Amino acid sequence: SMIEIDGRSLRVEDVYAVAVEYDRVSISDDTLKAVEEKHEAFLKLINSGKTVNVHIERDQEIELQKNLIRSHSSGVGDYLENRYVRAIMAVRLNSLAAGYSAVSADLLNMMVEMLNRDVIPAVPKYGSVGDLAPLAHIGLAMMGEGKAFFEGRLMDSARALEKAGLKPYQFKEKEGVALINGTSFMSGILSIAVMDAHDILENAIRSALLSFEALGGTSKAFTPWILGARPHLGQVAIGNRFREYLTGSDIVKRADSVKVQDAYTLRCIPQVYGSVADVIDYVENVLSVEINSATDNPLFNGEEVVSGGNFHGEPVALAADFLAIALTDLGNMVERRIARLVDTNLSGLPPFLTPDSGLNSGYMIPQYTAAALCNRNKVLAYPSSADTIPTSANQEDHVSMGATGSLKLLEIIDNVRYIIAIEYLLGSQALEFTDKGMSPSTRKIYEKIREKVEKLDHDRPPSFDIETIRKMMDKKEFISALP
């Protein structure tokens, strides 16, 4: 489909649509004409200010934009994946169209065409203290220097632009400044991350259904009036989701007739998962403002140019560290439920979910892998925004460090996705030891798993099944299986 950019209407899910699903972007002629008219008012104002040799003056200003793009292109490390650079470019484009950046219509159209033709700059992941260097690398590619991916093939930027039918872009007065000042690296990455955090929670709900039924949990933990006696919006909503999906379970109807309560990895699912949902909503609210905001500097309002601090990443740096914590602890709870599934003394199922403990270990070791992933996430959950280091000869003497936070959030998301893939695998196997009177919803998840991953009889490498299920998650196959 088509995402129209007007500088004020971008949603986080539209950033995803462009970056991950490759929807086209466009900008109306009306928007572009108003952008251009503001760009011209800005030129008139600076041309009057300087005269209170015109040719040497303009050529100097153009050289400045180039020197800035080049000197600031100082990232190191592996290139950021293309889905993230596309997200950053969509957010950057939208925020330059918000009306305060005084850039020209041509700069916006340049970014539109790079996105629609998939000329994606090569952006080293590291260098922003929260985003001059990564955005400079984007501009460097826009100028036809450095490297870029053309339809996923790395090459010199000038060759990628040429294969796409584009000309290198020449930055005008203050357009390099505009492009590289702001929070679009952090906010673009975090837009994708918050969408992937939502997808994590959705998958954790579905994978918990399998474990919850295999362990014969009671629905009493999701009683509406209990959940409403402590009405955080997340836990009320999560309780509703679980009640709906457990409807029709014979296993759970039996449990309700003979069980009072379960261990916390079942009974506390609404409190914990609903906290995670609340944090996701918090971050999405921050981003919803941020990706429609002017975060470059200085800014132009049509009659004056004023320097402020809107490039400072603090609100999104804090949000990235917060969501990292919440997701790490979601992963801890899923790992603990996996640890209960394979422990015959807690589950009431055969040890380690194998039919012959004699010469098989079953799924003993994926639980270690899940614990390993939690331990890695506990390192990564240290808040990068609790630190700051002065830059620019102490003139930029407090910084958010939110780029660190955005990048490590991406790894936590990757790791928690593997933990949940492990719960899909082991919860499906655990149900093989039940009478399978699971709800229709649980059975949709179970059947989708079994389309690609067989039940476990003799030992075989769990790694391959985990990777298959992780690929299914990344293709949204369980959300499709059970809306």
Footprint of a second copy on 330-369 (CB under 8 A): 332-333, 335-337, 339-340, 342-346, 351-352, 359-369
Rank residues 249 and 310 by Cβ distance to a second copy and give the closer one: 310
Which residues in the 165-204 window bind a second copy by CB under 8 A?
none
**DSSP class per residue in 94-106:** HHHTTSSS---HH
Q: Counting contacts by CB under 8 A, is residue 159 touching a second copy?
A: no
Rank residues 23 and 459 by Cβ distance to a second copy and give the closer one: 459
Name which position in 2, 54, 258, 389 contacts a second copy (CB under 8 A).
Answer: 389
Q: Counting contacts by CB under 8 A, is residue 322 touching a second copy?
A: yes
Distance of closest approach, residue 319 Cβ to a second copy, in angstroms: 9
- Tokens 């005084």 locate to 102
**DSSP class per residue in 212-271:** HHHTT--GGGG-HHHHHTS--HHHHHHHHHHHHHHTT-HHHHHHHHH-S---HHHHTHHH
Distance of closest approach, residue 264 Cβ to a second copy, in angstroms: 5
Which residues in the 3-62 window bind a second copy by CB under 8 A?
60
Name which position in 10, 380, 410, 416 contacts a second copy (CB under 8 A).
Answer: 380
Give the β-pairing of 2-4 and 24-26: parallel
Rank residues 231 and 483 by Cβ distance to a second copy and give the closer one: 231
Distance of closest approach, residue 195 Cβ to a second copy, in angstroms: 20
Rounded Cα gap, residues 118 and 104, in angstroms: 22
Binding mask 233-252 for a second copy (x = CB under 8 A): -xx-----------------
Total residues contacting a second copy by CB under 8 A comes to: 153
**Neighbouring residues of 375: CB distance < 8 A, sequence distance ≥ 6:** none
3-state class percentages of the chain: helix first, strand second, coil last, to nearest 5: 65, 5, 30
Tell me the residue type at 180. Answer: I
Name which position in 54, 394, 451, 483 contacts a second copy (CB under 8 A).
Answer: 394
Q: What phi and psi values does residue 306 have, to the nearest 5 degrees?
A: -130, 140
Rounded Cα gap, residues 193 and 190, in angstroms: 5
Binding mask 254-283 for a second copy (x = CB under 8 A): ------xx-xxx-xxxxxx-xx--xx--x-
The residues facing 150 across adjacent strands are 119, 153
Name which position in 33, 50, 230, 455 contacts a second copy (CB under 8 A).
Answer: 230
Rank residues 302 and 440 by Cβ distance to a second copy and give the closer one: 302
Judged by DSSP in three states, 120 sits in strand
Span of 49-57, 221-229, 244-252, 445-453 interacting with a second copy by CB under 8 A: 221-229
Residue 80's alpha-carbon distances to 75, 89, 200, 274, 293, in angstroms, are 11, 13, 21, 31, 24
Rank residues 93 and 403 by Cβ distance to a second copy and give the closer one: 403
